[PDB]
Amino acid sequence: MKIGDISIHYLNGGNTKMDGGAMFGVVPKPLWSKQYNANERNQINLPTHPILIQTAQYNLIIDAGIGNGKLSEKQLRNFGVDEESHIIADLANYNLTPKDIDYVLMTHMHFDHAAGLTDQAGHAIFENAIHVVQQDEWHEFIAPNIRSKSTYWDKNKGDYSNKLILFEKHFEPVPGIKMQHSGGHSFGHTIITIESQGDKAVHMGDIFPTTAHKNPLWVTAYDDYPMQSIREKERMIPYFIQQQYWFLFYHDENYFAVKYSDDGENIDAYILRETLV
Amino acid sequence: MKIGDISIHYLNGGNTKMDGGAMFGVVPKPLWSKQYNANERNQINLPTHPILIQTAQYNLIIDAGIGNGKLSEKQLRNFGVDEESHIIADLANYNLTPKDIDYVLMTHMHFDHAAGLTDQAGHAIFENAIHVVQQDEWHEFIAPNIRSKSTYWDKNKGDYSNKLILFEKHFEPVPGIKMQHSGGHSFGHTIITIESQGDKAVHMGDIFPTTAHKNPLWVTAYDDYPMQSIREKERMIPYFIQQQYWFLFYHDENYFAVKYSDDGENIDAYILRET
Amino acid sequence: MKIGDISIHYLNGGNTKMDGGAMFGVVPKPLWSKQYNANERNQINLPTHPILIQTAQYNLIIDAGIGNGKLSEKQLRNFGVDEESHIIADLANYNLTPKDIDYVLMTHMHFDHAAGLTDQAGHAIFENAIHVVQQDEWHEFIAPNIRSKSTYWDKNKGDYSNKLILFEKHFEPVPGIKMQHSGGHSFGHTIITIESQGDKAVHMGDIFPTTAHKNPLWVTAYDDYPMQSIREKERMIPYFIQQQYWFLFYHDENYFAVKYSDDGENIDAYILRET
Amino acid sequence: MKIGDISIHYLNGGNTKMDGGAMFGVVPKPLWSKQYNANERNQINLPTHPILIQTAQYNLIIDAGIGNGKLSEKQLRNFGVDEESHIIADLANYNLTPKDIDYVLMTHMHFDHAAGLTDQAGHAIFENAIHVVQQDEWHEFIAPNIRSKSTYWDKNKGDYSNKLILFEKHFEPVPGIKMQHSGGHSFGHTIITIESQGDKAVHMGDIFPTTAHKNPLWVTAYDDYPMQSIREKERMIPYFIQQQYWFLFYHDENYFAVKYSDDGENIDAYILRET
Amino acid sequence: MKIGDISIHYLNGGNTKMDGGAMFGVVPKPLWSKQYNANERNQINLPTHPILIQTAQYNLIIDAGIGNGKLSEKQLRNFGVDEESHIIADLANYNLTPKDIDYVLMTHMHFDHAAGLTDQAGHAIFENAIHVVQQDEWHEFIAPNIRSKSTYWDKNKGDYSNKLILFEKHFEPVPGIKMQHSGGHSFGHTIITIESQGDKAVHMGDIFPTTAHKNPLWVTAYDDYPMQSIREKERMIPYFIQQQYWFLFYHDENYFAVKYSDDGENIDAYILRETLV
Amino acid sequence: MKIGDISIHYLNGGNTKMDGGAMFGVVPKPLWSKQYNANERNQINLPTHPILIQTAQYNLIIDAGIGNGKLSEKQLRNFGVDEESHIIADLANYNLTPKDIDYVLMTHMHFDHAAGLTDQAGHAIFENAIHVVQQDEWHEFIAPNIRSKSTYWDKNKGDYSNKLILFEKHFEPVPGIKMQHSGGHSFGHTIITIESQGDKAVHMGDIFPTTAHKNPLWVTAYDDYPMQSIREKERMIPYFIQQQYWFLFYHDENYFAVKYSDDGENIDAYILRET
């Protein structure tokens, strides 16, 4: 993928199998099962593939996958992990090492996105990288309630917190990369946009998980504030489409990106996610 | 049943079938499917049974099922309606006719609770009945947003509004009956407690739909503000149990009332529903 | 006129006559009648002249007037309409047709500002134009409450919504043109600015209706949140004046454009509206 | 009159004449001038008659009128004052002196309601009386903003503050008398209710100024938060009517007490004010 | 102490020495040092004495002191603890055992108030007692931020949480005892009032720590929301005085209670706190 | 000092002595007393030194010490004033006189920052200067509450308000200078960043009073909203350090500017203050 001078790729940070009903909330199964595949256990396959962004000067990732040795044996099974992260080997394919990374931008701190931030002993994969998190997202991450406790794990704390930078509403790390507090899925959930030359790309995190969640009303049950999720989706998606943005995905098993035609119905351009088995 | 000097019963206002996942949210099917049955279309059976309350003077009612013919063919099929409201009949079995009512107390105005409020021409099924609805709930009902439009129907508007009484935080219509605003399921969602002598009963509406939703974390995906739902459930349930309250249900297909042991671990008493 | 390399005129989308006491809130008549006229109905004449902005590659329109055949017989009379929109004609006087308008920017969706967006049968005058509305202002438009119902009309919905775009706090449709959510008059009220070279112009919508509303304390009674209106006026006006901005009007029957002295106690330059 | 075992009359604490457009917000003159009179200054006559409540052991007063020699030469003229307070006299007609008043309950601290609390030199009419004000209403009174500055006067501060008591949402000074924060007209606006036996009375202050403001949509332009005013009126009035409450007025030149039919479309019983 | 049919007493739950400057916030030392005594280390002595309330039917406590064996050696020194809790022996003086207690009502969960809730191994002193806490207070107690972390300790969790009842704004446990959410010192801080016959008593917790904090403007620097503290004090104190309430204290070294004369200046009645050395 | 094309210096606007505990809040004396000296009265020395900024066109100024004679005898003693403002003199050393100023940018209006804004008759020390103050800060200043009345003085009002420009979230007066609303110390508290070429400087006002307040948890007891102060400090400081910003101080007696190592552990560069 290329957006102007910026190169965009995905990294195999592992995968998870989550219950379809929970990933589609109010949408009846008969309808969502036709848009996304589920197994005998009502689980749909959700890759956890970080997004590698390379500008002329900086290298950065959008999330960190499920890591290596982080999830227990019970969690690996309960979360349908087929394979753990291959983020090191994948990075090599681009002549990079978990040390040439300058920024790790987080959409949110749920385990499916932050487990791969540190190895065991909570050291920290990505030692020279500055880590950016929305301030309230971070606050809840370290002080989760009886509900967010299930995904915000102490086990995911670590050294990276040394080079931690917090932002409230918006933040532009390196030119062209803009983070923006969306809320909805998470109180501190963030979306990221990439712009180089005239090209535009956007990753709406878990506020637009997969291509099957394009309908603003189709939000996951995980969303702590679904009304805010809908609000954001109702306005962002039509705008990004009108502006001919490329939609990047972290969880979609089939596609890595998509560009809808100036209409809002037909998504002509789908960039397939060729994940090695 | 018996709640001090107050008598309580329920009415067959019809039934519906909602998608299991929509009803349990983040709870994996493998877990809730063992707590509540689902067909092959993945739907669970949910009665819409209004609760009839009678005191030495009034006989208000909680909700009004789905009604009779208020739903269209399409809707009758999409929500899996097997039988429409028998409200008029059931009420008769208690020497009460569609007119004796003294107060229709709403928990919220979603179609599965208010469609039975009027006939096909939007005329009140309950003339002479003061309809108490939470103020903010009433506003959203008559002014739905792109998501609320699915349950809030213009078609459920009617003459009953000419005897509409709104409230904010809490309201005690008749002695012993208290309506408390909870939010969660819908912004204006309300629960209702009935207390007389030493007895206590409570109906937590869609913030505690069925006995399978006892865990505060098990909230429906329909809840517009799940964080508020959990907040309310986390505090109410332990309190009502500690106080030995009877939990009344509107959508539960197996129970009408339940009373938990002094630790919430099990069901100590209960009243199944129907024949 | 023209701000830098951007051309700007005013279209005649009709007019209306609203009560004076309504247009001046707490301001006594013995004072506002010396700044504006009160026919004997106590109505003041309020034109509904949309603003046309022409840059290098785009044609924009701020609000759309009352339209043609949109208001009923009754409305025409109560809103004191003398002449309905001549928007089509006025545009022609600029070799511009309704299909050349690239953007329609709305300050708020009240009828005197949006009625002109569609013809009857709710088709849509201005096909091909992206319609920009601030989110909350659009949410309320399609879901009015008992007070907004009077100005947010259902017959004002239309095809234009197929090319609708929403923004929350600020948005730049095209270089130099900035939309900013102000609130006050209506929860989602929005003001607009135009900048080219060192030239600056601003239209503060119904938060600064006419030149007679310059005093921040002089807000209309129509304002749903007068405290926010004052807040915005108290800060914007002094700033725009200090920056030598041209104030554009939609409702001032006399002035179209105005610029205050640095001391802002007088109007140095102005452009009258050829009624 | 008297509610149950509580006596209630009205004192003449002076009067004022305020603009009509200001008193009726968005309501057109051709409509409000048929419900109230507009001298030619466009002013309507607003008495400032404090309400006297006498129970078994206490004497209470709601608001205090404009006082004596409190308004300057200029104010007297602009607020159309015909007669200054006769509060001392009127009280005497009840064998009551200013030192027998046990409680002074305020709806809000605007001048037409608080000017009468102290004489010049800000001493304090009504020594020995506990003065009840809602917290935020008092905070704003002593710290007015650019808009409140017009009605919250510094010369209205006084000794009475040595016996001041504040409440936030609700407060019962003496059995049967309840104060409730309503907001709307002023952030800290407060309405009051009196109950004895099955008799009920209520004074909704400036959230229901005169009988002509019964329509919830008819709020004054003075209301700093009109949306909250409507909210409160929309719910309170229907409830108070359903409960057969007597509506007491402070500003209605004609009526002092009123009671609507159950259907609330007519005024069944009333008490005129002997101007 | 007797309020109508209700008997009120204090229990020696230990003590703590906190920095005076922090306990008086904006009040210059020259002024507060004359109202409360400080040592060479600027520390003032603050007893942590729970309030025993006995009605005809129920027995209850207002807080739990610093406990026994709960604070470490480093904390005992840093917090100027002279003696640890004597709550068991004190209770005996009234023919009661840490088992005859029906309700433990908490004003807030800071360590100076909640450490004595459980013994080591977090079992739970007061096994048959129902524990009442404001819902938000509790939420922060288990999910404290970088600031409240210093007083909300995991080490204070325990069995008592089994019979935990939460309330939002107000709650009346047994007739005459009314809890009320005040906020200010803590987001979930609560005050308690006692009424029997015509007698009235009130404990405003850390929103009125000692008799030296009567001036509404004299709030501790510990208060997370001082503006709300002042708001509450500005209105409550004058009202409680006008109503001839007895003010009960948990932290005042000299006095256990006080009744100001219908004025708001002279506090004629002071009930001394005879603490055994 | 040098910040790209922008020149920065500071001025002796006088000094004060505040109680150490008030200044460090919850931080025990034994800890802060080792970070900042205190006399036997427990007071710490705090200069009130305005910061002079000069660009190729303007030369705005940050704060205005305490002034000259604005403080009374009592105040001069209670706040431990040793010397009053030498603002006029210092300004001269830079060929600038009390009139050249082009913008007085306030962080907040507490007396130790704004008393130097006017003379003994409330006349602006800085005619020709546009005074930029945060909107909400300005409101509280002119409308103090029982606690704010201690720093907000009526006596600090003046003609300067005739050139007052308010803002809400952020404002960039002249290129490179950005004012950002932070809250914390006071509701309207503002910080100011200066950036030119690759250089960056920031003055966090009373949200980072002295170098001893670097720990986000070390906030003054004066802060009306300490939780917001911590929030801002927790995020700003690490960011400004990562970006190699120069931290400018107004109250620090030893440093004027400081630059931390790339880890905040130590002070890598600095400019002491005075001779």
Side-chain angles (χ1 to χ4, degrees), chain E residues 103-161:
Chain E
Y103 291 98
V104 171
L105 317 179
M106 308 294 295
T107 69
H108 62 306
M109 296 294 300
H110 286 171
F111 84 92
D112 46 309
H113 293 61
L117 277 181
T118 67
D119 49 47
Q120 318 116 295
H123 173 200
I125 311 301
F126 304 120
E127 310 173 20
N128 305 306
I130 287 175
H131 295 222
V132 188
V133 188
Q134 125 77 31
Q135 180 160 34
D136 300 299
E137 177 65 41
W138 177 255
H139 287 175
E140 175 167 27
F141 165 65
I142 62 177
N145 53 234
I146 54 174
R147 162 159 161 147
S148 58
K149 171 209 305 178
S150 62
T151 49
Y152 292 135
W153 312 334
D154 286 339
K155 183 165 65 173
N156 288 167
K157 296 203 174 72
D159 282 51
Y160 63 81
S161 77

Side-chain angles (χ1 to χ4, degrees), chain B residues 231-232 234-235 238-239 242, chain E residues 130 135-136 139 166 168 171:
Chain B
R231 180 187 172 87
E232 297 293 295
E234 170 185 56
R235 114 168 183 288
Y239 174 73
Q242 189 289 309
Chain E
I130 287 175
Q135 180 160 34
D136 300 299
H139 287 175
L166 300 165
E168 292 182 357
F171 183 52

Side-chain angles (χ1 to χ4, degrees), chain D residues 24-249:
Chain D
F24 290 96
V26 311
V27 181
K29 186 180 184 175
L31 298 193
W32 59 258
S33 75
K34 309 271 200 297
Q35 279 288 318
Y36 229 81
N37 310 38
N39 81 6
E40 210 216 90
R41 319 258 318 109
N42 197 183
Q43 315 174 315
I44 72 173
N45 179 49
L46 292 184
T48 62
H49 293 50
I51 302 173
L52 170 67
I53 300 184
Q54 291 181 296
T55 70
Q57 313 177 311
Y58 299 111
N59 301 298
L60 321 198
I61 298 296
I62 293 187
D63 298 347
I66 59 185
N68 302 282
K70 289 304 314 303
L71 279 70
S72 70
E73 180 58 59
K74 180 167 296 192
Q75 302 175 305
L76 288 170
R77 185 177 56 249
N78 296 317
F79 296 129
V81 179
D82 292 303
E83 62 197 302
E84 279 178 281
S85 179
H86 296 169
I87 197 168
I88 304 301
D90 282 34
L91 281 174
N93 288 321
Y94 296 100
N95 68 265
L96 294 176
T97 73
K99 298 176 298 183
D100 291 2
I101 300 293
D102 291 295
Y103 286 108
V104 173
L105 303 175
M106 310 298 298
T107 59
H108 61 310
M109 295 293 270
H110 288 189
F111 85 92
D112 49 312
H113 296 74
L117 286 178
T118 67
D119 50 48
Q120 324 168 40
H123 172 200
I125 312 299
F126 301 121
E127 43 198 0
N128 283 315
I130 285 174
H131 292 249
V132 189
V133 190
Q134 100 80 60
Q135 204 158 9
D136 306 284
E137 178 65 33
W138 173 262
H139 280 165
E140 205 190 321
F141 173 69
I142 61 184
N145 50 233
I146 63 171
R147 166 167 161 109
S148 307
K149 210 205 292 116
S150 72
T151 45
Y152 291 133
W153 308 339
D154 176 78
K155 66 176 177 182
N156 282 171
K157 296 185 174 200
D159 276 55
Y160 67 91
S161 71
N162 302 327
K163 284 172 191 167
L164 186 59
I165 291 292
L166 306 172
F167 83 89
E168 324 199 335
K169 191 175 181 188
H170 64 67
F171 176 48
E172 232 191 319
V174 301
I177 312 297
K178 296 171 68 184
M179 293 168 78
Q180 172 191 178
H181 177 191
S182 79
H185 179 67
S186 68
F187 193 65
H189 192 271
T190 294
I191 72 154
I192 312 176
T193 62
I194 300 83
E195 304 185 307
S196 210
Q197 271 65 290
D199 303 320
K200 308 170 184 301
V202 65
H203 172 54
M204 279 168 72
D206 286 350
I207 231 52
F208 193 1
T210 72
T211 55
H213 293 83
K214 191 197 167 192
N215 185 315
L217 296 180
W218 287 36
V219 300
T220 82
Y222 292 119
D223 288 35
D224 295 338
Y225 305 88
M227 295 303 104
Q228 174 63 24
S229 288
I230 298 168
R231 179 186 172 89
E232 298 293 296
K233 292 176 70 182
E234 170 186 56
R235 115 168 182 289
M236 301 181 142
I237 296 177
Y239 173 74
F240 290 133
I241 287 180
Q242 190 289 309
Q243 292 286 291
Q244 298 207 186
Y245 267 71
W246 271 95
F247 284 90
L248 306 184
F249 294 96

Side-chain angles (χ1 to χ4, degrees), chain B residues 11-26:
Chain B
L11 317 173
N12 191 311
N15 77 307
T16 64
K17 295 203 177 62
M18 301 304 109
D19 178 88
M23 291 297 293
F24 291 94
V26 307

Side-chain angles (χ1 to χ4, degrees), chain C:
Chain C
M1 55 148 245
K2 68 183 297 74
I3 290 298
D5 301 315
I6 302 174
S7 302
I8 298 175
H9 303 99
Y10 61 83
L11 303 174
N12 161 38
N15 79 294
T16 56
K17 296 206 289 297
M18 306 292 110
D19 197 76
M23 292 299 288
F24 290 96
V26 311
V27 181
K29 186 180 184 175
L31 298 193
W32 59 258
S33 75
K34 309 271 200 297
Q35 279 288 318
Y36 229 81
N37 310 38
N39 81 6
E40 210 216 90
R41 319 258 318 109
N42 197 183
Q43 315 174 315
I44 72 173
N45 179 49
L46 292 184
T48 62
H49 293 50
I51 302 173
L52 170 67
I53 300 184
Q54 291 181 296
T55 70
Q57 313 177 311
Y58 299 111
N59 301 298
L60 321 198
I61 298 296
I62 293 187
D63 298 347
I66 59 185
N68 302 282
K70 289 304 314 303
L71 279 70
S72 70
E73 180 58 59
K74 180 167 296 192
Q75 302 175 305
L76 288 170
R77 185 177 56 249
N78 296 317
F79 296 129
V81 179
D82 292 303
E83 62 197 302
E84 279 178 281
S85 179
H86 296 169
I87 197 168
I88 304 301
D90 282 34
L91 281 174
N93 288 321
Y94 296 100
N95 68 265
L96 294 176
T97 73
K99 298 176 298 183
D100 291 2
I101 300 293
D102 291 295
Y103 286 108
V104 173
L105 303 175
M106 310 298 298
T107 59
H108 61 310
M109 295 293 270
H110 288 189
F111 85 92
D112 49 312
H113 296 74
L117 286 178
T118 67
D119 50 48
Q120 324 168 40
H123 172 200
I125 312 299
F126 301 121
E127 43 198 0
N128 283 315
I130 285 174
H131 292 249
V132 189
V133 190
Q134 100 80 60
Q135 204 158 9
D136 306 284
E137 178 65 33
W138 173 262
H139 280 165
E140 205 190 321
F141 173 69
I142 61 184
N145 50 233
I146 63 171
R147 166 167 161 109
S148 307
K149 210 205 292 116
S150 72
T151 45
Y152 291 133
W153 308 339
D154 176 78
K155 66 176 177 182
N156 282 171
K157 296 185 174 200
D159 276 55
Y160 67 91
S161 71
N162 302 327
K163 284 172 191 167
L164 186 59
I165 291 292
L166 306 172
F167 83 89
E168 324 199 335
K169 191 175 181 188
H170 64 67
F171 176 48
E172 232 191 319
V174 301
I177 312 297
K178 296 171 68 184
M179 293 168 78
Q180 172 191 178
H181 177 191
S182 79
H185 179 67
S186 68
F187 193 65
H189 192 271
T190 294
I191 72 154
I192 312 176
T193 62
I194 300 83
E195 304 185 307
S196 210
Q197 271 65 290
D199 303 320
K200 308 170 184 301
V202 65
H203 172 54
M204 279 168 72
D206 286 350
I207 231 52
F208 193 1
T210 72
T211 55
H213 293 83
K214 191 197 167 192
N215 185 315
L217 296 180
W218 287 36
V219 300
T220 82
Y222 292 119
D223 288 35
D224 295 338
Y225 305 88
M227 295 303 104
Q228 174 63 24
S229 288
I230 298 168
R231 179 186 172 89
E232 298 293 296
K233 292 176 70 182
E234 170 186 56
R235 115 168 182 289
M236 301 181 142
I237 296 177
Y239 173 74
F240 290 133
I241 287 180
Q242 190 289 309
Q243 292 286 291
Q244 298 207 186
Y245 267 71
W246 271 95
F247 284 90
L248 306 184
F249 294 96
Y250 175 89
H251 288 295
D252 203 86
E253 57 181 346
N254 307 73
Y255 310 111
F256 157 70
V258 168
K259 179 178 292 182
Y260 297 86
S261 47
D262 300 60
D263 184 83
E265 280 187 62
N266 314 83
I267 292 180
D268 293 336
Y270 61 60
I271 299 180
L272 295 198
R273 181 184 251 97
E274 294 302 295
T275 77

